[PDB]
């Protein structure tokens, strides 16, 4: 019952989707934190010093207000981001307004779920954390290979997802009134540094982006420069 | 909706013994209005081949870019083999005939050196008929240039004095300077007698060394 994509097990399970989740588990750590306004952080494994620093960007931008990160098979995430860009462009052409985050999440979920209905294809081997800011405020969403997606206050996926989830829960409990933008960036850097301990014997690079009202004018921008260095120093101090 | 237009240019191609010359006016106009005083129409397409399409500006530009792309792909697919002038002429014929039912509204002249090293000029019609010639003028001033070239290049209707028209004047070798002088005089006359002709003359000379460019001023500067 684990040889085809669209075959139910005797207990009602789809083993190909579970194997895709197992493939996602091998990916690097990617986290997303929502503030009152959102912040996406990813760890890039430096397999060798031959790699050029800051040349393998993993966080992707959809329209001018959506930020996406993924853990798993990077080409699958890139394909999903291309499909999301196509859908966003179609929505913007048809209705002249930027696509709302729930609508984009629904489109991605429908696409991923349709990729699990036939045995001529295989489910995506990525888990995606994507978010942004629209007329209704700041939104964060997490989508799985099964096609199910949910909104989160904080989300994490990859090898070190458990430590990141624990840190996110502690931060949510300690901040019932929310977080700011710079504080969210610092917390994301700290959580990435703490979750990197699942590897230890491997250098890594931190990549951070944010999208909130004020300091970004409701658009998605990459955190680069003095702010990123301050976040890295704060993460190293903790 | 009329999908065609006229921009009123004049070009001329002359093949020498070991050189070729392709000249053109630089005035772009439409309906008694001057769009531009310097809009070149003669381009170096590579492999010592110089091409010029006259008439509809958009169709000419499209044909020139398509021919350049064809040369690039020919170099890619045949180990950078040089494209001969006859092969280029046949390829341009196929390109023109590919849209015979929606033809380019242009007259095309290409120039270069043949496989033996002599000057070669090929003339094309809008729907894709081509012939190799020694002197060919195209545009609105072609009727004002070709008789002059026939009289001053082929020495037609000229006979040796003292023979009472029994011995024709023999053909003589013409250097590139003489061809340049004849082209300049013909274009000056065309500028004098044609309203659409004359803002500047651009000449491309093709030899074994390569392609070189010269420019001269005309009236209505």
């Amino acid at each position: 019952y684990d040889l085809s994509n669209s075959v139910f097990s005797p207990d009602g399970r789809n083993f190909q989707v579970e194997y895709a989740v197992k493939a996602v588990e091998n990916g690097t750590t990617s986290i997303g934190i929502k503030c009152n306004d959102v912040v996406f952080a990813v760890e890039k494994l430096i397999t060798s010093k031959l790699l050029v620093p800051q040349k393998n960007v993993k966080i992707q931008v959809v329209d001018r207000h959506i930020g996406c990160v993924y853990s798993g098979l990077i080409p699958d995430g890139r394909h999903l981001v291309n499909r999301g860009r196509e859908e966003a462009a179609s929505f913007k052409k048809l209705y002249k307004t930027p696509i709302p985050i729930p609508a984009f999440a629904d489109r991605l979920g429908q696409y991923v779920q349709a990729h699990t209905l036939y045995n001529s294809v295989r489910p995506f081997g990525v888990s995606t954390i994507f978010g942004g800011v629209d007329k209704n405020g700041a939104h964060l969403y997490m989508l799985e290979p099964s096609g199910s997606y949910w909104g989160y206050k904080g989300a994490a996926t990859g090898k070190g997802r458990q430590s990141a989830k624990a840190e996110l829960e502690k931060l949510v409990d300690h901040h019932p009134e929310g977080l700011s933008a710079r504080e969210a960036v610092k917390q994301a850097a700290k959580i990435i540094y703490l979750a990197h301990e699942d590897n230890k014997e491997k250098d890594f690079e931190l990549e951070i982006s944010w999208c909130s009202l004020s300091e970004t004018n409701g658009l998605h921008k990459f955190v680069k420069g003095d702010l990123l260095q301050e976040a890295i120093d704060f993460a190293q101090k903790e | 909706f009329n999908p065609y237009g006229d921009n009123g240019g004049t070009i001329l191609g002359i093949a020498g013994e070991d050189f070729a010359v392709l000249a053109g006016d630089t005035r772009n106009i439409t309906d008694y209005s001057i769009n531009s005083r310097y809009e070149p129409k003669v381009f170096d397409c590579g492999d010592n081949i110089v091409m010029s399409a006259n008439g509809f500006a958009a169709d000419g530009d499209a044909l020139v870019k398509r021919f350049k792309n064809s040369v690039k792909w020919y170099h890619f697919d045949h180990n950078d083999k040089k494209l001969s002038i006859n092969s280029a002429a046949r390829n341009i014929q196929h390109l023109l005939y590919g849209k015979r039912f929606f033809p380019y509204y242009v007259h095309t002249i290409i120039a270069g050196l043949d496989e033996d090293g002599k000057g070669a000029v090929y003339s094309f019609d809008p729907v894709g008929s081509y012939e190799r010639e020694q002197c060919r003028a195209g545009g609105a001033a072609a009727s004002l240039i070709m008789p002059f070239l026939d009289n001053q290049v082929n020495f037609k209707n000229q006979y040796e004095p003292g023979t009472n028209g029994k011995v024709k004047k023999p053909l003589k070798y013409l250097s590139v300077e003489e061809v340049i002088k004849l082209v300049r005089d013909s274009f000056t006359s065309a500028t004098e007698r044609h309203i659409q002709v004359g803002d500047g003359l651009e000449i491309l000379i093709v030899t074994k060394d390569g392609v070189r460019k010269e420019f001269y001023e005309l009236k209505r500067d």
Binding site: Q16, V21, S48 | -
Partner: protein
């Protein structure tokens, strides 16, 4: 294995064995080394022949006057990918009159490679690529795997016994990056790097190919007697 008859089947541990076999097909190919500096990028390829009466197969394909690649693995797949890259570069040069960036070509190749690893009825490519180019952002070198993973490095090597060249590049990383005024010095560095991967073999004018791109340097290939002074 019961999860190996097609590319649309995941292993219980989450692996695609067809992609792994395609990767292993690269390991049975000749070694090719790529490196770059601020001004120039160089590819060095060791060629092979069927026997003493046959010629050496070409390993470097030109994509555009500012971009080229070298292959390791299945030659026809490399030809297909090179034709696709030529078409993309020509489209960019025609529609927008802009020279295509190397990163854009990397993204295009990544997408095309991914599209062949998810649909039933097709197979993944069986060749690895080292792509060099020069654009407004400088010189770029990229490594391409059939899985769709594209990486940017100062230097890399693919094929068989590639660990020696990669180790040499890692050791001498701080040296060949600063080689900007002398393209021939960068070519010498690449040749010395690929020499570490030779298994009881000697570089000859028959099995050595050297491609180079640079700032004021169209993509130029040296083969045969052209590589006499680099041996």
């Amino acid at each position: 294995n019961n999860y190996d008859g097609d590319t649309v089947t995941f292993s219980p541990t989450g692996r695609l064995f067809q992609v792994e076999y395609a990767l292993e097909a690269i390991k049975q190919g000749s070694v090719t080394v790529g490196l770059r500096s601020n001004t120039h990028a160089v590819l060095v390829a060791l060629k092979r022949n069927a026997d003493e009466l046959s010629s050496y197969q070409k390993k470097i394909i030109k994509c555009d006057e500012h971009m080229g690649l070298s292959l390791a693995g299945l030659a026809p797949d490399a030809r297909v990918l090179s034709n696709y890259l030529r078409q993309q570069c020509n489209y960019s040069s025609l529609v927008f009159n802009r020279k295509l960036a190397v990163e854009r070509a990397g993204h295009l190749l990544c997408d095309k490679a991914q599209k062949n690893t998810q649909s039933y009825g097709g197979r993944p490519y069986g060749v690895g690529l080292l792509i060099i180019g020069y654009d407004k952002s400088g010189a770029h070198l990229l490594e391409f795997q059939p899985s769709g993973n594209v990486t940017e490095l100062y230097g890399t090597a693919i094929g068989a016994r590639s660990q020696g060249a990669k180790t040499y590049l890692e050791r001498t990383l701080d040296t060949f990056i600063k080689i900007d005024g002398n393209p021939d010095e960068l070519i010498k560095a690449g040749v010395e790097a690929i020499s570490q991967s030779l298994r009881d073999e000697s570089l000859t004018v028959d099995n050595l190919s050297i491609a180079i791109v640079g700032k004021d340097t169209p993509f130029t290939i040296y083969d045969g007697e052209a590589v006499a002074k680099y041996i």
